[PDB]
């Protein structure tokens, strides 16, 4: 362990894509895995367990996640930069806590799912969004280190 938020997020999105509508990976998830030197398996036990938690969060809040995601994607002009803004508005507004971290992860993964499922979403949107979410999430790194890492967090 000591895996980055980037690797865990990417392992969740890959895991998710596998579990969803014929299980193929979008080109940009193949790329991110290459460029993020993806060292974590998407079928690893931390990933499978976190997948459960995030999928629950998404269901309890199915409509909010949908609504919020659409408002974002229909209004952004640079998807890349805009991911970084919502991240900061969540996290540097009274510390991070477990739920906000997990609600963000849930949100990114959900976002990824919607993009890779919709066959007509342009490549560049799927691409910048994924890059957008992985880069923003680097900001959780220091704070999850303070807590012993992702594997630790889900262990207790």
């Amino acid at each position: 362990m000591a895996y980055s938020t980037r690797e865990i997020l990417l392992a969740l999105c890959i895991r998710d894509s596998r579990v969803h509508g014929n299980g193929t990976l979008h080109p940009v998830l193949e790329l991110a895995a290459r460029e993020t030197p993806l060292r974590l398996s998407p079928e690893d036990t931390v990933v499978l367990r976190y997948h459960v938690l995030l999928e629950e969060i998404i269901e309890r809040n199915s409509e909010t996640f949908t609504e919020t995601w659409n408002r974002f994607i229909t209004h952004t002009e640079h998807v890349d930069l805009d991911f970084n803004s919502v991240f900061l508005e969540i996290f540097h507004r009274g510390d991070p806590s477990l739920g906000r971290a997990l609600a963000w992860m849930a949100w990114c993964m959900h976002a990824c799912r919607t993009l890779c499922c919709n066959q007509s979403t342009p490549y560049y949107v799927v691409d910048l969004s994924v890059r957008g979410m992985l880069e923003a999430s680097e900001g959780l790194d220091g704070w999850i280190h303070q807590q012993g890492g992702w594997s630790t967090l889900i262990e207790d």
Binding site: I57, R71, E89, R93, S97, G99, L102, A103, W107
Partner: peptide
Amino acid sequence: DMRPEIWIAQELRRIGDEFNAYY
């Protein structure tokens, strides 16, 4: 406009808090 991102940030904060006592 640049006001949606701050709405989303609001929601996720709530859901984040909601979760905290609920697991």
